[PDB]
């Protein structure tokens, strides 16, 4: 299987290969990275937001693999446009984090993959 506390540890590392098995577990159990089980729970914050936090030299090699696994899972509510849900951080998104972290490389990467700019 493949689970949140493993995944959130992988998205902070410089090697994405530890994601192997995630697409198989998601697509065999009919689940997606936008589902509540794969979020920080207090805010509805996702693995992609946790990947856009802590960028090494302005980039993170795990972001494209996460977006590939999400597209390969067939998720209707695409991970790139997932937002926080609590009263304080409602509507916060990975694109807002990429902009505040000052990574034009990450903003380009998110917008190329269908990040809603509105």
Swiss-Prot record:
Ubiquitously expressed. Expressed in dorsal root ganglia, trigeminal ganglia, spinal cord (Lissauer's tract, dorsal horn and dorsal columns) (at protein level). N-glycosylated. Phosphorylated by PKA. It is found in: Cell membrane; Cytoplasm; Melanosome. ANK repeats lie at residues 1-42, 43-89, 90-118. Coiled coil: none annotated. The modification Phosphoserine is found at residue 9. Belongs to the transient receptor (TC 1.A.4) family. TrpV subfamily. TRPV2 sub-subfamily. Homotetramer. Interacts with a cAMP-dependent protein kinase type II regulatory subunit (PRKAR2A or PRKAR2B) and ACBD3. Interacts with SLC50A1; the interaction probably occurs intracellularly and depends on TRPV2 N-glycosylation. Calcium-permeable, non-selective cation channel with an outward rectification. Seems to be regulated, at least in part, by growth factors, like IGF1, PDGF and morphogenetic neuropeptide/head activator. May transduce physical stimuli in mast cells. Activated by temperatures higher than 52 degrees Celsius; is not activated by vanilloids and acidic pH. This is Transient receptor potential cation channel subfamily V member 2. The lineage of its organism: Eukaryota, Metazoa, Chordata, Craniata, Vertebrata. The chain holds residues 74 to 191 of 761 of the full protein.
């Amino acid at each position: 299987r493949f689970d949140r506390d493993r995944l959130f540890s992988v998205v902070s590392r410089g090697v994405p290969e530890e994601l192997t098995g995630l697409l198989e577990y998601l697509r065999w159990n009919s689940k997606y990275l936008t589902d509540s089980a794969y979020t920080e729970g207090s805010t509805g914050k996702t693995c992609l937001m946790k990947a856009v936090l802590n960028l090494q030299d302005g980039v993170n090699a795990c972001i494209m693999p996460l977006l590939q696994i999400d597209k390969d899972s067939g998720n209707p509510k695409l991970l790139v446009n997932a937002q926080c849900t609590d009263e304080f951080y409602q509507g916060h998104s990975a694109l807002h984090i990429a902009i505040e972290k000052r990574s034009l490389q990450c903003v380009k990467l998110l917008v190329e993959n269908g990040a809603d700019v509105h």
